[PDB]
Amino acid sequence: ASRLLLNNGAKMPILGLGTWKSPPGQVTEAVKVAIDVGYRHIDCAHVYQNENEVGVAIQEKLREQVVKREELFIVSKLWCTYHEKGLVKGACQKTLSDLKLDYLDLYLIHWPTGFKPGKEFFPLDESGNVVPSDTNILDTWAAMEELVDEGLVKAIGISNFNHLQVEMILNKPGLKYKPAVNQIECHPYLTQEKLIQYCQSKGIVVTAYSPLGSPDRPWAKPEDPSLLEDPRIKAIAAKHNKTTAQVLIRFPMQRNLVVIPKSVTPERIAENFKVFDFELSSQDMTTLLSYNRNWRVCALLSCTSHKDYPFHEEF
Numbered sequence: 001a002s003r004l005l006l007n008n009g010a011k012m013p014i015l016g017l018g019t020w021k022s023p024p025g026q027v028t029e030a031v032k033v034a035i036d037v038g039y040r041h042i043d044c045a046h047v048y049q050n051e052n053e054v055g056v057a058i059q060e061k062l063r064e065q066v067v068k069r070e071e072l073f074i075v076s077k078l079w080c081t082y083h084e085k086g087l088v089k090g091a092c093q094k095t096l097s098d099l100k101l102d103y104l105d106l107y108l109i110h111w112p113t114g115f116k117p118g119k120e121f122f123p124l125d126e127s128g129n130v131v132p133s134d135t136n137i138l139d140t141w142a143a144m145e146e147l148v149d150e151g152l153v154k155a156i157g158i159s160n161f162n163h164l165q166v167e168m169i170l171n172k173p174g175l176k177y178k179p180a181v182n183q184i185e186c187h188p189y190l191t192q193e194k195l196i197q198y199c200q201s202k203g204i205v206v207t208a209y210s211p212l213g214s215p216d217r218p219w220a221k222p223e224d225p226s227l228l229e230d231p232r233i234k235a236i237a238a239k240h241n242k243t244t245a246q247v248l249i250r251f252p253m254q255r256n257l258v259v260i261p262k263s264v265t266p267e268r269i270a271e272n273f274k275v276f277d278f279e280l281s282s283q284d285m286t287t288l289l290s291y292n293r294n295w296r297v298c299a300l301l302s303c304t305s306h307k308d309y310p311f312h313e314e315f
């Protein structure tokens with residue numbers, strides 16, 4: 001069941017189900033199976049274009065008395081086109097209506113980069129590059145703070161923020177709510193030891209996304225590395241009578257991180273849950289950390305020139 005304590009007093013399930021790339025015609029079933037198997041944490045976002053169909057699953061399990069609403073921990077994220085002051089509440093309410101809830105447990109700023117408002121998720125000019133908003137991180141944070149005061153979200157957080165951008169929020173004049181969570185990419189090829197040590201020293205919980213290396217990302221190449229097929233990680237799995245996927249989900253848990261693997265496959269959803277009944281040794285852990293290559297799945301390469309692009313700093 002286990003769970004980590006956030007700085008608002010709530011408890012967050014250390015395992016959750018991810019839904020980026022989960023088709024609208026498969027995800028309702030995937031979330032229904034997850035909840036049956038014992039998942040109590042769903043990771044969502046407006047930009048995934050499937051929050052209505054995730055919502056259908058959640059409502060069905062609530063009607064069925066499988067879970068009560070307080071048992072679930074539902075996360076969504078504010079997309080970059082909604083960073084302006086007067087648009088943050090509207091974006092939150094559209095996500096709440098699609099999911100058919102009256103509050104979210106955790107709401108994140110998806111990326112620190114603000115885009116020009118519009119229907120397009122990545123708005124372009126006549127030259128073909130992304131158009132930025134003139135908004136900043138601190139104003140967007142003040143808008144996220146008033147959602148807490150209004151009762152729409154219980155906790156607020158951030159995603160893909162480097163340590164200097166988190167610093168900016170922690171040092172903000174009149175800061176009312178600290179970020180509860182920083183959701184970042186993390187796996188054996190991108191171990192993030194400095195950003196994790198920094199967040200954990202300030203009482204911010206880390207969530208690890210793309211824990212299996214995201215083999216189904218639409219920009220995948222044949223000569224890219226594959227975590228699931230790494231012989232060295234295959235060896236560690238075989239020693240424990242577990243799968244490679246189970247080892248990759250266990251690894252962040254023993255670093256005190258929340259982990260959110262995605263699957264629409266009922267047998268893999270079940271497999272990803274059976275991770276609470278074994279331990280990686282400190283030797284296994286230190287070996288898995290040594291596999292760091294500084295390789296990113298999610299690099300937001302179209303915004304490399306944005307004033308708030310997060311990945312120019314070391315951590």
Ligand SMILES: NC(=O)c1ccc[n+]([C@@H]2O[C@H](COP(=O)([O-])OP(=O)(O)OC[C@H]3O[C@@H](n4cnc5c(N)ncnc54)[C@H](OP(=O)(O)O)[C@@H]3O)[C@@H](O)[C@H]2O)c1
Nearest residue numbers: 018019020209210211212213214216245261262263264265
């Ligand atoms: N904050 C952000 O900016 C951000 C960015 C990226 C990701 N995330 C979140 O983190 C979640 C997880 O990361 P991700 O979706 O990039 O990738 P992932 O969880 O690392 O991997 C998903 C892929 O692995 C496959 N898989 C799942 N279980 C497996 C198993 N036991 N054996 C073999 N293959 C397995 C899935 O296939 P099937 O589905 O076909 O089973 C799918 O192809 C996302 O869905 C999203 O919720 C957030």
Ligand SMILES: O=C(O)Cc1ccccc1O
Nearest residue numbers: 020045047048110298300
């Ligand atoms: O940031 C994420 O969660 C992954 C994602 C989803 C849709 C478009 C771009 C993109 O990087």
